[PDB]
């Protein structure tokens, strides 16, 4: 398990992911040092809804 | 051993400081900890 | 188009739905007078991720 | 000592997060979280 | 005609006051409008 | 005049929302939104 295998995110984004059932292990972070940003979660959720509304 | 009213939440704070240390280093974590204490003092923590 | 056909939600929940790509027409509101609550959006998103992570 | 905050958006998330805990759950809970964080950070050689 | 910097956002505020009127009635909308003006005054709107 | 706020969580959403607009976009934008809201509400017979 190198650093890329680990989730990096602030307590705010971790709470947001908890509240919406997002597994941050599945979100690609684009912030500094790979941190997962609010916009990364938003993009992930938008796409999940898309795949679900198209099942 | 004080009571943790929401350990799932606590786990996320602890994983957050671990990931700062891992990806950004001890100096960055010291800065954020210093900033966090100061903001908590403004609230009433100390 | 009777009232049940219309979305009822505060500007806060409408903004949240915009930010995460949620079509509030698809969310069942459980608040007063059928208003769509934060918890209704959360439940909807949690389930959409579930369906998507299981496509 | 400390350089200019290399990432103020990150810092703001932390300060906002503890702010929310204080308002929604109270100063005792925020004190508990900060205590647990300090103990965790010490394991990583952070004071 | 003043400029709307974000009409998608404006549309959501306007749909929100429409849905209060439709589902809760004029009295409730008057109350919320009164509350909203007072909070905006505290900010600087008026 | 007005009864006890029948739904303070709803009211809080509105007040928080306009608060956020003011901080992120400024008083001129919040003024614009409130002006557009008043004009909309008048169509529904609300002053």
């Amino acid at each position: 398990a190198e650093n890329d295998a680990y989730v990096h995110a602030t307590p705010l984004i971790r709470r947001l992911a908890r509240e919406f059932g997002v597994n941050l292990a599945k979100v690609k972070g684009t912030g500094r040092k790979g941190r997962i940003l609010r916009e990364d979660v938003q993009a992930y959720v938008k796409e999940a809804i898309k795949r679900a509304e198209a099942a | 051993f004080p009571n943790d009213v929401d350990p799932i939440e606590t786990r996320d704070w602890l994983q957050a400081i671990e990931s700062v240390i891992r990806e950004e280093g001890v100096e960055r974590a010291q800065y954020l900890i210093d900033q966090l204490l100061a903001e908590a003092r403004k609230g009433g923590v100390n």
Side-chain angles (χ1 to χ4, degrees), chain A, chain B:
Chain A
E2 294 291 355
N3 291 0
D4 74 283
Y6 279 94
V7 153
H8 176 35
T10 67
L12 202 80
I13 298 305
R14 291 181 191 265
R15 185 184 176 43
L16 170 76
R18 192 202 173 174
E19 256 143 38
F20 291 83
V22 171
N23 171 10
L24 286 178
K26 296 169 171 342
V27 185
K28 176 190 136 223
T30 63
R32 175 166 181 276
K33 312 285 199 195
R35 199 178 80 247
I36 295 162
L37 304 173
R38 183 181 181 87
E39 81 199 58
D40 301 326
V41 178
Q42 286 162 340
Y44 174 85
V45 168
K46 277 176 199 191
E47 172 77 2
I49 290 163
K50 197 263 172 223
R51 312 185 254 170
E53 281 320 311
Chain B
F1 286 149
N3 201 234
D4 190 340
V5 301
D6 189 357
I8 281 151
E9 182 186 53
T10 309
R11 182 175 175 259
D12 287 337
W13 282 82
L14 298 185
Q15 282 184 343
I17 202 56
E18 291 185 65
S19 70
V20 171
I21 294 160
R22 185 183 66 243
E23 311 288 339
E24 303 181 66
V26 161
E27 326 83 87
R28 175 74 177 152
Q30 291 174 333
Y31 173 78
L32 288 176
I33 276 159
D34 163 277
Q35 290 292 308
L36 190 60
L37 280 173
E39 171 89 12
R41 284 193 297 274
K42 267 135 73 153
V45 171
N46 262 35

